[PDB]
Amino acid sequence: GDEKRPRTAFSSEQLARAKREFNENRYLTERRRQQLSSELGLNEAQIKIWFQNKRAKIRRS
């Protein structure tokens, strides 16, 4: 994105991941969220529950 980032906390490589990270949880919410909720047989209180658990993927950090 920018043209002047350090090389410790994130040399853009980590900043770019933040995008791709949500990019896989920003559209599906309105692209496939209906497909899941449909085959999942639940409500919004469970939809987020899936991705909410996937957001960690065994890291809780």
PDB file of C-alpha atoms in Angstrom:
ATOM      1  CA  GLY A   1       0.000   0.000   0.000  1.00  0.00           C
ATOM      2  CA  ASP A   2       2.387   2.683   1.231  1.00  0.00           C
ATOM      3  CA  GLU A   3       6.012   3.285   0.245  1.00  0.00           C
ATOM      4  CA  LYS A   4       7.791   3.750   3.572  1.00  0.00           C
ATOM      5  CA  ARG A   5       7.281   0.945   6.091  1.00  0.00           C
ATOM      6  CA  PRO A   6       9.733  -0.482   8.683  1.00  0.00           C
ATOM      7  CA  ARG A   7      10.949  -4.078   8.934  1.00  0.00           C
ATOM      8  CA  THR A   8       9.987  -5.171  12.446  1.00  0.00           C
ATOM      9  CA  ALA A   9       6.321  -5.079  13.468  1.00  0.00           C
ATOM     10  CA  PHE A  10       5.373  -5.407   9.802  1.00  0.00           C
ATOM     11  CA  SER A  11       7.232  -4.527   6.608  1.00  0.00           C
ATOM     12  CA  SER A  12       3.963  -4.331   4.647  1.00  0.00           C
ATOM     13  CA  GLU A  13       3.968  -8.096   4.281  1.00  0.00           C
ATOM     14  CA  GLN A  14       2.053  -8.277   7.541  1.00  0.00           C
ATOM     15  CA  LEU A  15      -0.047  -5.251   6.607  1.00  0.00           C
ATOM     16  CA  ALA A  16      -1.036  -6.951   3.359  1.00  0.00           C
ATOM     17  CA  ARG A  17      -2.096 -10.067   5.260  1.00  0.00           C
ATOM     18  CA  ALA A  18      -4.602  -8.030   7.272  1.00  0.00           C
ATOM     19  CA  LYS A  19      -6.446  -7.361   4.018  1.00  0.00           C
ATOM     20  CA  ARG A  20      -6.308 -10.862   2.565  1.00  0.00           C
ATOM     21  CA  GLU A  21      -7.181 -12.003   6.076  1.00  0.00           C
ATOM     22  CA  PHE A  22     -10.529 -10.205   6.074  1.00  0.00           C
ATOM     23  CA  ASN A  23     -10.875 -10.508   2.303  1.00  0.00           C
ATOM     24  CA  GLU A  24     -11.783 -14.112   3.109  1.00  0.00           C
ATOM     25  CA  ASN A  25     -14.346 -12.957   5.676  1.00  0.00           C
ATOM     26  CA  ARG A  26     -15.719  -9.702   4.275  1.00  0.00           C
ATOM     27  CA  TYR A  27     -17.676 -10.691   1.162  1.00  0.00           C
ATOM     28  CA  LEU A  28     -18.684 -14.322   1.839  1.00  0.00           C
ATOM     29  CA  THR A  29     -20.669 -12.760   4.651  1.00  0.00           C
ATOM     30  CA  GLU A  30     -22.935 -11.590   1.825  1.00  0.00           C
ATOM     31  CA  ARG A  31     -21.727 -14.018  -0.869  1.00  0.00           C
ATOM     32  CA  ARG A  32     -21.856 -17.492   0.690  1.00  0.00           C
ATOM     33  CA  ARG A  33     -23.169 -16.604   4.163  1.00  0.00           C
ATOM     34  CA  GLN A  34     -26.604 -17.434   2.789  1.00  0.00           C
ATOM     35  CA  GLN A  35     -25.331 -20.775   1.493  1.00  0.00           C
ATOM     36  CA  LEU A  36     -23.956 -21.749   4.882  1.00  0.00           C
ATOM     37  CA  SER A  37     -26.831 -20.440   6.973  1.00  0.00           C
ATOM     38  CA  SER A  38     -29.014 -22.396   4.535  1.00  0.00           C
ATOM     39  CA  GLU A  39     -27.222 -25.731   4.939  1.00  0.00           C
ATOM     40  CA  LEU A  40     -26.423 -24.898   8.567  1.00  0.00           C
ATOM     41  CA  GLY A  41     -30.041 -24.385   9.585  1.00  0.00           C
ATOM     42  CA  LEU A  42     -29.530 -21.573  12.079  1.00  0.00           C
ATOM     43  CA  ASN A  43     -29.541 -17.806  12.606  1.00  0.00           C
ATOM     44  CA  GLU A  44     -27.024 -14.945  12.637  1.00  0.00           C
ATOM     45  CA  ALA A  45     -26.169 -15.918  16.222  1.00  0.00           C
ATOM     46  CA  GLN A  46     -24.541 -19.068  14.840  1.00  0.00           C
ATOM     47  CA  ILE A  47     -23.233 -17.796  11.532  1.00  0.00           C
ATOM     48  CA  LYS A  48     -20.670 -15.605  13.181  1.00  0.00           C
ATOM     49  CA  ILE A  49     -20.020 -18.581  15.452  1.00  0.00           C
ATOM     50  CA  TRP A  50     -18.429 -20.447  12.539  1.00  0.00           C
ATOM     51  CA  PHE A  51     -16.093 -17.749  11.301  1.00  0.00           C
ATOM     52  CA  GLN A  52     -15.692 -16.640  14.919  1.00  0.00           C
ATOM     53  CA  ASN A  53     -14.038 -19.994  15.555  1.00  0.00           C
ATOM     54  CA  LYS A  54     -12.249 -19.963  12.201  1.00  0.00           C
ATOM     55  CA  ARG A  55     -10.789 -16.528  12.951  1.00  0.00           C
ATOM     56  CA  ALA A  56      -8.560 -18.228  15.521  1.00  0.00           C
ATOM     57  CA  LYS A  57      -7.854 -21.560  13.827  1.00  0.00           C
ATOM     58  CA  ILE A  58      -6.092 -22.647  17.025  1.00  0.00           C
ATOM     59  CA  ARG A  59      -4.158 -19.568  18.100  1.00  0.00           C
ATOM     60  CA  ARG A  60      -6.296 -17.498  20.497  1.00  0.00           C
ATOM     61  CA  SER A  61      -3.766 -14.660  20.305  1.00  0.00           C
TER      62      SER A  61
END
